[PDB]
Amino acid sequence: PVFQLSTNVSQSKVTPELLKQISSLVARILHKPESYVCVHVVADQSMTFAGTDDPCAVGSLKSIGGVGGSQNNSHAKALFALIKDHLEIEGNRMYIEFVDIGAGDIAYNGRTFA
Template sequence: MVVLPQYVMIVLKGSVPMAFGGTQEPAAYGKLVSIGGLDPDVNKKLSAGIASILESKLYVPESRFYLKFSDSKRSDFGWNGSTF
């Protein structure tokens, strides 16, 4: 998978009240949307990389977050007055 930085967008919302597994310890939920390129092997690698970042930078243990992967068609995304 080739990642073109000019097409990567990240939104972080801190201080959102969240309960995970019955506690309010640090936790996270993420949604990763791609225009093609996702498959089980890629998702596993992305999950491991994101888990490492969440744990080292935001102190969220890998056991306290869910990550949802969605693969979309190019025509499902509008940009610059058109679609991809």
């Protein structure tokens, strides 16, 4: 399970503790061990949303399962909640994409999972 986020806010707000809290939350919402969670947050990007350069973000959560349907709604609410409290990005200027990956299409330690 991989969570990636791009934002135009300052790298000052992207603390190593934020990455930890994201990691923990992703493990919880996907019901997978945190030992497999990878988090990547990218700051101070050149980004617009709705034509303006005000604070915004685009992210994605990629997983083998756990990313289909109304579960994505509940999971979104939590991720949006965490990202705003820490990065102060309004919900109406952020997207998070949910991407289901096949076991044969992701390699860990040199081999696919299936």
